[PDB]
């Protein structure tokens, strides 16, 4: 079950069922926007490059659970953590266990960088129109986006992504407003309002 720890404390993740025989448990780290990487093998051996502050458990005594332990937790430790358990008394396991997310509390807030583009001459020439609102490098990841035709709120025609965590632990998102060229030109301007952590940024474009 997911966990959140403050920097410089330690996290423990427990994966799989209790052992029966001897084991050789591997641990995998899957950072956001990255391929998974091996961080522990043969219970507690470390590929070169993995800091000592990552540790797996012994397979003695039996009947215990594979537990990954990270001390001196830091922002970069935010990832999903799986295990691959091999047990001398159990048939080989093909699905990875775990996937527990580690949230590192107390990272600094980052305000969204918001960029609003009007529809292009080419798109308008293809008798279509799309406002493009880009929202990047913000933390925490919760955001809400509202569109305005002049001063009237617009919900119809809007497609807004779910925020996705980047490699640098910040989030990105984007929102689209589909117009007809005639609608785009009818209101005097359009606005993209992004609200994040009690602040609302407004970007505006006009024909």
């Amino acid at each position: 079950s997911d966990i959140s720890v403050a920097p410089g404390e330690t996290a423990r993740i427990s994966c799989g069922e209790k052992s029966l025989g001897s084991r050789a448990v591997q641990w995998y780290q899957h950072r956001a926007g990255q391929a998974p990487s091996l961080i522990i093998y043969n219970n507690q051996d470390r590929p070169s490059g993995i800091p000592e502050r990552f540790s797996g458990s012994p397979d003695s005594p039996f009947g215990t659970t594979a537990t990954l332990t990270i001390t001196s937790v830091e922002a970069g430790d935010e990832a999903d953590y799986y295990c691959h358990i091999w047990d001398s008394r159990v048939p080989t396991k093909w699905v990875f266990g775990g996937g527990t997310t580690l949230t590192v509390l107390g990272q600094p807030k980052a305000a969204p960088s918001v960029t609003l583009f009007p529809p292009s001459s080419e798109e308008l020439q293809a008798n279509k129109a799309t406002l493009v609102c880009l929202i990047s490098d913000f933390y925490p990841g919760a955001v809400t986006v509202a569109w305005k035709a002049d001063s009237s709120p617009v919900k119809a025609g809007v497609e807004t992504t779910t925020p996705s965590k980047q490699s640098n632990n910040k989030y990105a998102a984007s929102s689209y407003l589909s117009l007809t060229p005639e609608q785009w030109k009818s209101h005097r301007s359009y606005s993209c309002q992004v609200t994040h952590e009690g602040s609302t940024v407004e970007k505006t474009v006009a024909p």
Binding site: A35, G99, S121
Partner: protein, 229 residues
């Protein structure tokens, strides 16, 4: 040093065969085992099977004998075939160099040891979607630029399925590039934007082209984007 580039059709019709290929450089395919893992939308990782030059090869029984892993020494490639594609076969597929170890917990002669596997080098994986729906290439549009910097980009509109790649100036421009995760439209089609933050002073002098590739539809497009009137 070692790099794994897995490639596939990026669309497969139900009850048809999925064929994926993993290109290897920096390493000989003969020196180790090779695995495929598939992550489904959301979380989870499923080890699909592993292959070796000596032919020590096994497969997850959950895949109901539908998969084949092979090696081509001349092309230094690993192959994955997935017969009878179903919706539950979608997701991102990883190629990964797999190494073996030996857990010896007792007396060897009494067989008191087993072989385990770990996967130390993973590729970035390739997206696979199962659907009777037809591929649609994206339409690409320029997003012209207006603190001492300017943002310009490309709109990649109405494509299916994922994924598309965006490079700038043929790869030469990566500093300050943000390619945004696609939006899934209620139409079932995808869009995405690629934006680059540039020094304002360069708007006239330097040229900016976005290179969009949507392989499933064989769509390759270059869009030149410059400031407008």
């Amino acid at each position: 040093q070692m790099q794994l580039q897995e490639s596939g059709p990026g669309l497969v019709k139900p009850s048809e065969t999925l064929s994926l290929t993993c290109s290897v450089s920096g390493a000989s395919i003969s020196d180790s085992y090779w695995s495929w893992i598939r992550r489904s939308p959301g979380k989870g990782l499923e080890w699909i099977g592993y292959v070796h030059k000596s032919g020590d090869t096994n497969y997850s029984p959950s895949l109901k004998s539908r998969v084949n892993l092979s090696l081509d020494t001349s092309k230094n490639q690993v192959s994955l075939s997935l017969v009878a594609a179903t919706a539950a076969d979608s997701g991102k597929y990883y190629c990964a160099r797999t190494l073996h170890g030996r857990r010896i917990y007792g007396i060897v002669a009494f067989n008191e040891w087993f072989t385990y596997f770990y996967m130390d080098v993973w590729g970035n994986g390739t997206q696979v979607t199962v659907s009777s729906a037809s591929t649609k290439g994206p339409s690409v549009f320029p997003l012209a630029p207006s603190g001492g910097t300017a943002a310009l980009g490309c709109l990649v509109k109405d494509y299916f399925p994922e994924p598309v790649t965006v490079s700038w100036n043929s790869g030469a421009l990566t500093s300050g590039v943000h390619t945004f995760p696609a939006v899934l439209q209620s139409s079932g089609l995808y869009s995405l934007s690629s934006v680059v933050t540039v020094p304002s002073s360069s708007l006239g002098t330097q040229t900016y082209i976005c290179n969009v590739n949507h392989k499933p539809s064989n769509t390759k497009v270059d869009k030149r984007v410059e400031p407008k009137s």
